[PDB]
């Protein structure tokens, strides 16, 4: 039979593919570029907008916009360009023919779902659609029915306690620090050493520095004193033009804002204490099963040492005889997509789709009724 | 008691004087000239380098270097000549005997404060030193404890939200357009009318044209159409040799790059939208008090009509019932110095100085510890 | 169909021909001579003015004026004589019937294009016209869409960064040394050996000496010491009357002024450091593609060894791992014309012409609106 498409609209990347695939067929940055300079050469073949890897390749010429931030779609014409590029150019598939499983972060505006449905049925004429909470899919991806999923993207971080297949919607924490606020903090701190990264194309060098060289300290104050006392932590990277830049204690300082959001001037507590505060909202019978099965998910958890720092720093909070275990599979960057791929292939799922008949009857409001 | 010296190292001017004075005793361009021609006449009395007004007077014979650009000190031997000239020739004061309050733009490299301290204690042997953020002083100068200071120099522009005496360091914007990039744009556009100004001495004619004849349009497109349609805006100026040059729509076009940095090929937004984007990073309880108390500061805000254009163009951004107020005192060129003069004279301040004893104990790193 | 004429008004030469030709059909010096002596023989057949090769042949009898200097047309009656000579005598073509693609150096006065258009439509009654930046055509001529073109004529030198067909107009350098200031320096230095060349006709002996015998040193100080220590570099040339003149270390000394304009008392940096300073104004993402694809253009780059000296002396500036490549085709003297010939033959271009209908409606100001 026709497979469903499975598509995950991160803030940072699009992952897309067919249900039953083991890994996503298309991954590219969800970015739209426009030329910001006079077009001098006649007959070059101008283009109004680049998308994804095209906009990465040209990015010296372009202003780069992200059309999703904090999991909210903030201008629709770009997001529609990104989906158009996903179906027709990256997957090369007619959306006429496949159900589409979309994805959303919990507790975000109700308008976002309605629009995200309206555009699938009016623009792409999809046969049937669904929208699934990100943190639920990471449990399918990790073989579990019980756990507290910490999921962190480019734009949003959230905890969702799930016990025996029941979500506990009063206990859902959402926290709005993510890889993008780490990147803006990294630019601000890098400025201390004289390196200044200003433009949208130049921000995305800093993003690559963060990915390659950052790591999480297992004692922030001890490594602060160490790197204040030794060159041993100092490490170096080449900019695209061949300038070499050298980066020291600062490389652990940026992912530390996940554990001390006050560095960004964010009042809220770090990911460890919002995880513990999520388990403390659950019924006392299930805390023992949520102290095991802490599942990490999404790219902002890819930093070296984040699992050890989490286990250490929850174990300082939790009672002394609960076995704290953090579960961080190495593919956790893709785990939301892998779990969507499993979910879309279950036969029990095939009743759940919102079919076009139902959207015609109900209008887009149906997405709240026929969905979590 | 001994007064402190108060000295402000702009990119363009040095202002220096004694604490408790109402206005600076020495103002001169922070420029160092060296002779670039064969010395024909024997016994004239050669000099290796001129500084300040000496280099202005001779400037036909000299290459003029600015040793600070973008608030960063880019070669130290010149800057040390400029300070030597400030203490010994302009103030006529032994630096052995007075504390010195220096000044700096926020968020610039940390090696600049270290060197700027090391040179005060080793070279000039000052008893005690301090370094203060420029935009903080303009609030002392304008009688306020709350405001968002827009400060624009020869080299750097920055916004610093301050509420009730607390800075909000995550909301600090720094923008790298300033009077010198306006001057280089002015030279480029003036070339359209046939006037070409090429050399460093000749640049400093254009700087004086910019100061005398430029103004900010209250509607850029309407005055563009006007000056394209009428001689009424066309105005004329004498070069040093008596050539008259005539300047039209172009005279408003150069300060417009502050509001449309794309004219220079600068990707970032103008000073208005960075001000609004600075207020949007502050907590919602304080925005009402940061929408009043927009304080203009520094020379690049001296253009006729810039306060009106700011108020107009923020009022298009802010919600319709916030009272937008721009505060632009006529001495705002000196307001950073005036606020330094106030700060250095408070008795509560006399504990804050970095005394040489402490620099001997700690070394120059102390400047980060004992200072903002 | 009617071909376009393609005509390039260098300061030194006119190159003209038909679009789609591989090389220009008419090349002659853009020079106008007038007789300066009493006409003794009756019935000889006086002429008010000679142009081009006529003025070369007679030049002992004539004062030779150049009507373009530094890429600016400084008296129009001569330039109009030169165009008259190009259409009617060299191409032997009615300008009524062919579009004319003219050419101009960047960043020069806007009046020059207005007049240069007005004369084509009123005087020559051309059907349609265009004006194109010189350095843009050398990329069409050298098969590239990305590069920084260094182009140096008789009158002007300019760098134009072009990346992927977008110009970066803030990074365009114009520098005012060129073949004619090399010639005036060559006369001044030749005076050292006793040879004195004074008149306008005799200047154009010096130009031929410069073309035949000058070359660029790959290490200025080493060849200075060599030619100061050996006759081996000394080479000799015949004046038109049969006097032999002998030229030594001096023959490399004149093109060195391109790299050290201080020899002429020009404050600005040489062509190498303006090339590097142009690449440093571009976005950091594109510098790697502008460090390859340095395209030489125009006659003043024809000196032996200039490509090697450029590569050497940029490689001393650029970061150690960028591949610096200088691209210097042997026809680079004609490359601006060849690229104009390519551009005028594209079918996408045929909408770009300024047609007489549009000039009638708009007047000559249209040249700024409808053109780069």
């Amino acid at each position: 039979e026709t497979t469903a498409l499975v598509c995950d609209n991160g803030s940072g990347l699009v992952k897309a593919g067919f249900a039953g695939d083991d890994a996503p067929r298309a991954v590219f940055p969800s970015i739209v570029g426009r030329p910001r300079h006079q077009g001098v050469m006649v007959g070059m073949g101008q283009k109004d907008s680049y998308v994804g890897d095209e906009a990465q390749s040209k990015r010296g010429i372009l202003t780069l916009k992200y059309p999703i931030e904090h999991g909210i779609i903030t201008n629709w014409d770009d997001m529609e360009k990104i989906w158009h590029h996903t179906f027709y150019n990256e997957l090369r598939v007619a959306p006429e023919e496949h159900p589409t499983l979309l994805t959303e972060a919990p507790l975000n505006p109700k308008a976002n779902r309605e629009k995200m449905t309206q555009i699938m049925f009016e623009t792409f004429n999809v046969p049937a659609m669904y929208v699934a909470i990100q943190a639920v899919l990471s449990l399918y991806a990790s073989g579990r029915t019980t756990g507290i999923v910490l999921d962190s993207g480019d734009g949003v971080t959230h905890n969702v306690p799930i016990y025996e297949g029941y979500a506990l919607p009063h206990a859902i924490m959402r926290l709005d620090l993510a890889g993008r606020d780490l990147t803006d903090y990294l630019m601000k701190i890098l400025t201390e050493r004289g390196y200044s990264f200003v433009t949208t194309a130049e921000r995305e060098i800093v993003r690559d520095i963060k990915e390659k060289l950052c790591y999480v300290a297992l004692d922030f104050e001890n490594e602060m004193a160490t790197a204040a006392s030794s060159s041993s932590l100092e490490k170096s990277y080449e900019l695209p033009d061949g300038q070499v830049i050298t980066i020291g204690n600062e490389r652990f300082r940026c992912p530390e804002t996940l554990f001390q959001p006050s560095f960004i001037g964010m009042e809220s507590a770090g990911i460890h204490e919002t995880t513990y505060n999520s388990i403390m909202k659950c019924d006392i019978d299930i805390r023992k099963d949520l102290y095991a099965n802490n599942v990490m998910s999404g790219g902002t958890t890819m930093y070296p040492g984040i699992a050890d720092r989490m286990q250490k720093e929850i174990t300082a909070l939790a009672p002394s005889t609960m076995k704290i275990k953090i579960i961080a599979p190495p593919e956790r960057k893709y785990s939301v997509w892998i779990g969507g791929s499993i979910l879309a292939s279950l036969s029990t799922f095939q009743q759940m789709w919102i079919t076009k008949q139902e959207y015609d009857e109900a209008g887009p409001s149906i997405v709240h009724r026929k969905c979590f | 008691e001994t007064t402190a010296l108060v000295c402000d190292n702009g990119s363009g001017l040095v202002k220096a004087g004694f604490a408790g004075d109402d206005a600076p005793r020495a103002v001169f361009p922070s420029i160092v000239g060296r002779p670039r021609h064969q010395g024909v006449m024997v016994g004239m009395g050669q000099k290796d380098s001129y500084v300040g007004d000496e280099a202005q007077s001779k400037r036909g014979i000299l290459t003029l270097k600015y040793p600070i650009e973008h608030g960063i000190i880019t070669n130290w031997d010149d800057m040390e000549k400029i300070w030597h000239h400030t203490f010994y020739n302009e103030l006529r004061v032994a630096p052995e005997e007075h504390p010195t309050l220096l000044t700096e733009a926020p968020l610039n490299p940390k090696a600049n404060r270290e060197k700027m301290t090391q040179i005060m204690f080793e070279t000039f042997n000052v008893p005690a030193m301090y370094v203060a953020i420029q935009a903080v002083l303009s609030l002392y100068a304008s009688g306020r404890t709350t405001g968002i200071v827009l400060d624009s120099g020869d080299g750097v522009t920055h916004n610093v939200p301050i509420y009730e005496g607390y800075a909000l360091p995550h909301a600090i914007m720094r923008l790298d357009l300033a009077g010198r990039d306006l001057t280089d744009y002015l030279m480029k556009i003036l070339t359209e009318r046939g006037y070409s100004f090429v050399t460093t001495a000749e640049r400093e004619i254009v700087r004086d044209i910019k100061e005398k004849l430029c103004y900010v349009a209250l509607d850029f497109e309407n005055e563009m159409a006007t000056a394209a349609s009428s001689s009424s805006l066309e105005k004329s100026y004498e070069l040093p040799d008596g050539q008259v040059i005539t300047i039209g729509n172009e005279r408003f076009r150069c300060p417009e790059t502050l509001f449309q940095p794309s004219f220079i090929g600068m990707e970032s937004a103008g000073i208005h939208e960075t001000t609004y984007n600075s207020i949007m990073k502050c907590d919602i309880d304080i925005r009402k008090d940061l929408y009043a108390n927009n304080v203009m500061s520094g020379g690049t805000t001296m253009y006729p009509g810039i306060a009106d254009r700011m108020q107009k163009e923020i009022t298009a951004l802010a919600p319709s019932t916030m009272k937008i107020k721009i505060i632009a005192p006529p001495e705002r060129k000196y307001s950073v110095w005036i606020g330094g003069s106030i700060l250095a004279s408070l008795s509560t301040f006399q504990q804050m100085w970095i005394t040489k004893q402490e620099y001997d104990e700690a070394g120059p790193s102390i400047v980060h510890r004992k200072c903002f | 169909e009617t071909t376009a004429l393609v005509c390039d008004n260098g300061s030194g030469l006119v190159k003209a021909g038909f679009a789609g030709d591989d090389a220009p059909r008419a090349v002659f010096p853009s020079i106008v001579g007038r007789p300066r002596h009493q006409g003794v023989m009756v019935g000889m057949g006086q002429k008010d003015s000679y142009v081009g090769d006529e003025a070369q042949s007679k030049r002992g009898i004539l004062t030779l004026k150049y009507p373009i200097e530094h890429g600016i047309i400084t008296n129009w009656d001569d330039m109009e004589k030169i165009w008259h000579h190009t259409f009617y005598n060299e191409l032997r073509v009615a300008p009524e019937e062919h579009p004319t693609l003219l050419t101009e150096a960047p960043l020069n006065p806007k009046a020059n294009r207005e007049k240069m258009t007005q004369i084509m439509f009123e005087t020559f009654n051309v059907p349609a016209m265009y004006v194109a930046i010189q350095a843009v055509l050398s990329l069409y001529a050298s098969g590239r869409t990305t590069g920084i073109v260094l182009d140096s004529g008789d009158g002007v030198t300019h760098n134009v960064p072009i990346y992927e067909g977008y110009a970066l107009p803030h990074a365009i350098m114009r520098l005012d040394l060129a073949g004619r200031d090399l010639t005036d320096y060559l006369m001044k230095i030749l005076t050292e050996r006793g040879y004195s060349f004074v008149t306008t006709a005799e200047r154009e002996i010096v130009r031929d000496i410069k073309e035949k015998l000058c070359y660029v040193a790959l290490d200025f100080e080493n060849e200075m010491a060599t030619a100061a220590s050996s006759s081996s570099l000394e080479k000799s040339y015949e004046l038109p009357d049969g006097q032999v003149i002998t030229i030594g270390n001096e023959r490399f000394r004149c093109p060195e002024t391109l790299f050290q304009p201080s020899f002429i008392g020009m404050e600005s940096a040489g062509i190498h450091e303006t090339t590097y300073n142009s690449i440093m104004k571009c976005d950091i993402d594109i510098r790697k593609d502008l460090y390859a694809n340095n395209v030489m253009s125009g006659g003043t780059t024809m000196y032996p060894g200039i490509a090697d000296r450029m590569q050497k002396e940029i490689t001393a500036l650029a970061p150690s791992t960028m591949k610096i490549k200088i691209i210097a085709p042997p026809e680079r003297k004609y490359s601006v014309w060849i690229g104009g010939s390519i551009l005028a033959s594209l079918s996408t271009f045929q909408q770009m012409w300024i047609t007489k209908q549009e000039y009638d409606e708009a007047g000559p100001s249209i040249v700024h609106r409808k053109c780069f």
Binding site: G194, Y195, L239 | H70, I72, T74 | -
Partner: peptide, 7 residues
Amino acid sequence: WXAXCPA
């Protein structure tokens, strides 16, 4: 500066 700009 040291990277992103000339100073």
